């Protein structure tokens, strides 16, 4: 079949499956090929999820409690993965900026206060502020 081939190849080239899960999907395809569109679907669902587990797992600016709270939330509901990941990254930046703007060596306290205030006012420029801070810290380096 032509659906069989596209599903076979797609399942074969999903990056975030272990070997056993991939081989199980594929063996289910061999068993009843008429279930291709189902098998592929959940396989993609299983990929999109596990990828997520990795990314939040490797968000350096969150502690274990926050990370595995996001992981558990991802398990209790897989379908909102796209949301749970996004909001997690937005936390990461937010908590990173705060820390870096505090623990960064070469800023004077006027700049530091200004950054902490602009950060408390609007965290949506967290990534910007942090960036703007790092550059500043490097431009004023010894």
Author numbering: 36 to 177
In the authors' words:
We thought that proteins with alpha helices at both their N- and C-termini might be fused to generate artificial repeat proteins by connecting the C-terminal helix of the repeating unit to the N-terminal helix of the next repeating unit. To test this design strategy, we used a protein A domain as the repeating module and generated 3-, 4- and 5-module repeat proteins. All these repeat proteins were successfully produced in E. coli and could be crystallized. In the crystal structures, all the repeating units were connected as designed. The twist and bending angles of the fused helices were very similar to those of the ideal helix. Interestingly, the protein A modules in the crystal structures, especially the last ones, exhibited significant structural variation, and close structural analysis demonstrated that this structural diversity was due not to the helix fusion but to the intrinsic flexibility of the protein A module.
Here, we propose a method for generating proteins and protein complexes with complicated shapes using fusions of alpha helices. To design amino acid sequences that can stabilize the alpha helical structure of the fusion sites, we superimposed one or two turns of terminal alpha helices of connecting proteins using a molecular graphics program. Then, the amino acid residues important for forming a fused helical structure were chosen from the two natural sequences in the superimposed region. Our method does not require complicated computer calculations for the design process and can be used for the assembly of artificial protein complexes with predictable and rigid structures.
